[PDB]
Amino acid sequence: MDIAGTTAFITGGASGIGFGIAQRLLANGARLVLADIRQDHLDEARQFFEERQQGRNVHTIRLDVSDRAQMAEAARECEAVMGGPDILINNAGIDPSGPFKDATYQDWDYGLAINLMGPINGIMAFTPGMRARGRGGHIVNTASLAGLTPMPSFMAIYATAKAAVITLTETIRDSMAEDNIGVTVLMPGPIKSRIHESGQNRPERFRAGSGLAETEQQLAKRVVADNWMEPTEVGDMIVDAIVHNKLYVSTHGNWRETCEARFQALLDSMPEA
Amino acid sequence: MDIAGTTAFITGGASGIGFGIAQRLLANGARLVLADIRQDHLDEARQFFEERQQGRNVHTIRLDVSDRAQMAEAARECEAVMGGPDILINNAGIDPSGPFKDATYQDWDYGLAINLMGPINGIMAFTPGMRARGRGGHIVNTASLAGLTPMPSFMAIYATAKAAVITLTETIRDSMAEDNIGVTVLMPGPIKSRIHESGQNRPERFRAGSGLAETEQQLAKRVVADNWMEPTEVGDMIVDAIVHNKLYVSTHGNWRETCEARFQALLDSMPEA
Numbered sequence: 001m002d003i004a005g006t007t008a009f010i011t012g013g014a015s016g017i018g019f020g021i022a023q024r025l026l027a028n029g030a031r032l033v034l035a036d037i038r039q040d041h042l043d044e045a046r047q048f049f050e051e052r053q054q055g056r057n058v059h060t061i062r063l064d065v066s067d068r069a070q071m072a073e074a075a076r077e078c079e080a081v082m083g084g085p086d087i088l089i090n091n092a093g094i095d096p097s098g099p100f101k102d103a104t105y106q107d108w109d110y111g112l113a114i115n116l117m118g119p120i121n122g123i124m125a126f127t128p129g130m131r132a133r134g135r136g137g138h139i140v141n142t143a144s145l146a147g148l149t150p151m152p153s154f155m156a157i158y159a160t161a162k163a164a165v166i167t168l169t170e171t172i173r174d175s176m177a178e179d180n181i182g183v184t185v186l187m188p189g190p191i192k193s194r195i196h197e198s199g200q201n202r203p204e205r206f207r208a209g210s211g212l213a214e215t216e217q218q219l220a221k222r223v224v225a226d227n228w229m230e231p232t233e234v235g236d237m238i239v240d241a242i243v244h245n246k247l248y249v250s251t252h253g254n255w256r257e258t259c260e261a262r263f264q265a266l267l268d269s270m271p272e273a
Numbered sequence: 274m275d276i277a278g279t280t281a282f283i284t285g286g287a288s289g290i291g292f293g294i295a296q297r298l299l300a301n302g303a304r305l306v307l308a309d310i311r312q313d314h315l316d317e318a319r320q321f322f323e324e325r326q327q328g329r330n331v332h333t334i335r336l337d338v339s340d341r342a343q344m345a346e347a348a349r350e351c352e353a354v355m356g357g358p359d360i361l362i363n364n365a366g367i368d369p370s371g372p373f374k375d376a377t378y379q380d381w382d383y384g385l386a387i388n389l390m391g392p393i394n395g396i397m398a399f400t401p402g403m404r405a406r407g408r409g410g411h412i413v414n415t416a417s418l419a420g421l422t423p424m425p426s427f428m429a430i431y432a433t434a435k436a437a438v439i440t441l442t443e444t445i446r447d448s449m450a451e452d453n454i455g456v457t458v459l460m461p462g463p464i465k466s467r468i469h470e471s472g473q474n475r476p477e478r479f480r481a482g483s484g485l486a487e488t489e490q491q492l493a494k495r496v497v498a499d500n501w502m503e504p505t506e507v508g509d510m511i512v513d514a515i516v517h518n519k520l521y522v523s524t525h526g527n528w529r530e531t532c533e534a535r536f537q538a539l540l541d542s543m544p545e546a
């Protein structure tokens with residue numbers, strides 16, 4: 001679908017990959033709603049586009065994607081202020097990783113709430129309107145290659161949710177197709193971003209009784225490598241996927257062989273038909 | 274691991290695949306705790322083993338695997354009444370399928386609660402004791418080939434949860450291995466069972482506001498095909514998986530080519546590293 005003249009609603013749109021996607025959709029003629037739990041991120045993002053005199057084409061909403069009431073309100077606000085959206089980017093996510101034995105129910109609930117229920121809430125809150133307006137659209141869900149290649153127990157909560165997001169995206173494709181809505185699941189490798197600030201981004205209700213505060217502290221000090229990919233490069237991949245209705249977008253090929261070995265082991269478990 | 278003398282805790286153990294696993298584990302010397310939400314299933318299972326003069330080695334607990342308090346209770350009751358468990362079979366599941374546009378938040382919450390949080394609750398409630406007792410053990414999670422092969426939107430909630438269970442099992446392997454606990458994900462194709470009674474098995478709190486009551490009513494009328502696999506055949510596959518610590522068990526080969534096509538599409542999305 002053509003991006004010119006559309007409105008895109010982007011969760012986690014005020015940092016990292018979501019912001020990279022925002023820049024590139026804007027550059028291709030979309031107007032933007034950036035939805036984010038971090039007010040300081042939102043302010044920074046707003047100032048960025050204002051410095052380039054694009055502030056008119058950008059709206060910001062502070063919310064938690066795991067709050068269904070806020071998501072319903074945001075769908076109404078998007079339509080009322082910016083129109084649509086035609087393009088739904090369910091991109092917000094956090095890193096709930098840590099020693100597996102230390103993880104508590106609060107950590108599981110947190111990890112699944114943001115990284116799996118966030119995209120589901122986006123679909124449930126926004127796609128009824130996307131269907132009803134009858135001008136098609138597109139959905140991008142940001143999963144991870146960690147949802148595909150074998151991962152260690154330290155990243156169990158993350159990997160589990162991201163694998164579910166890949167399958168979610170695959171399965172909804174034919175339903176969304178009924179109303180000319182395409183879908184893409186984005187599976188990145190290492191991208192420069194601020195996901196190391198995940199501890200700050202954890203919603204209040206998931207903090208008490210967490211077992212992973214110490215890991216979140218260490219994560220906060222992690223240096224962003226200069227050889228990680230730029231968010232705007234990922235943005236261009238998403239422009240391409242939206243224009244050409246591509247189901248899968250992977251940013252890196254470094255886990256091709258590890259994925260192949262996993263896939264082989266799965267096939268090998270199958271008897272002869 | 275050696276099955277003789279162990280205790281196996283089996284969710285959904287009073288019907289279908291779980292009951293097939295129950296029979297073959299008992300045949301190989303395990304004692305059983307069958308945990309199930311359906312009292313009539315539990316009573317039938319009880320009579321079956323009583324008629325075969327094995328009742329002393331089978332204890333039944335009525336519970337909902339998505340109730341964490343009940344699962345904590347079950348871990349205490351299992352240990353106190355039958356010992357252990359050494360073998361944890363997170364097998365309970367339901368069919369939340371239906372026209373995708375009809376599904377509501379209640380249907381998502383139901384489907385994920387039972388099919389994804391059920392196994393997680395099992396791991397969280399039972400594996401600390403399994404580590405502590407220091408005699409090793411094994412975990413079997415029942416996913417589905419629907420978590421692997423591409424599925425239509427009618428089965429979105431089911432597929433999404435089952436894909437997650439596969440990845441969950443992969444990721445916990447190294448942690449569990451620290452304490453000589455092996456893990457297996459079971460991925461069945463069509464097995465003779467009573468999963469068509471899923472409407473009856475939906476916990477009360479997920480009933481009001483569901484959009485799929487009509488689908489559940491149709492499902493209840495579905496005839497179990499004679500050429501579907503016997504649960505006891507699946508049971509023997511699981512005996513082998515526990516004895517030999519096999520990560521993957523698939524019961525059918527019918528989706529080899531559709532999985533291959535999916536895997537190839539995933540790999541094709543990856544650039545040259």
Ligand SMILES: NC(=O)C1=CN([C@@H]2O[C@H](COP(=O)(O)OP(=O)(O)OC[C@H]3O[C@@H](n4cnc5c(N)ncnc54)[C@H](O)[C@@H]3O)[C@@H](O)[C@H]2O)C=CC1
Nearest residue numbers: 012015016017036037064065092093188190191193194195
């Ligand atoms: N190496 C990487 O950066 C990779 C990132 N991903 C995924 O990319 C997505 C975007 O993350 P990044 O750009 O890397 O990090 P980021 O932290 O720079 O951007 C994420 C934004 O989402 C926001 N956010 C977090 N929780 C939220 C919530 N509950 N509600 C609303 N907004 C929330 C954050 O405040 C942040 O502004 C995530 O889903 C992440 O899992 C996947 C693969 C690789």
Ligand SMILES: NC(=O)C1=CN([C@@H]2O[C@H](COP(=O)(O)OP(=O)(O)OC[C@H]3O[C@@H](n4cnc5c(N)ncnc54)[C@H](O)[C@@H]3O)[C@@H](O)[C@H]2O)C=CC1
Nearest residue numbers: 285288289290309310337338365366417463464466467468
């Ligand atoms: N063709 C098949 O039968 C296939 C089954 N599966 C999976 O096999 C597993 C076992 O299901 P089946 O043996 O087929 O059906 P089943 O309905 O005969 O057995 C499942 C048992 O789990 C119980 N149960 C349901 N919800 C529960 C809950 N919240 N708490 C405690 N117990 C609960 C049921 O009462 C039932 O006795 C499920 O996870 C299912 O998704 C996967 C692929 C294929």
Ligand SMILES: COc1cc([C@H](O)[C@@H](CO)Oc2ccccc2OC)ccc1O
Nearest residue numbers: 095144145146149188189190191195196
């Ligand atoms: C760069 O920050 C992170 C990035 C991820 C990503 O989802 C993925 C990158 O695709 O992490 C991995 C994926 C595949 C293999 C190894 C990965 O890192 C451990 C997870 C957690 C993070 O803190």
Ligand SMILES: [Mg+2]
Nearest residue numbers: 334335336346
């Ligand atoms: Mg009780």
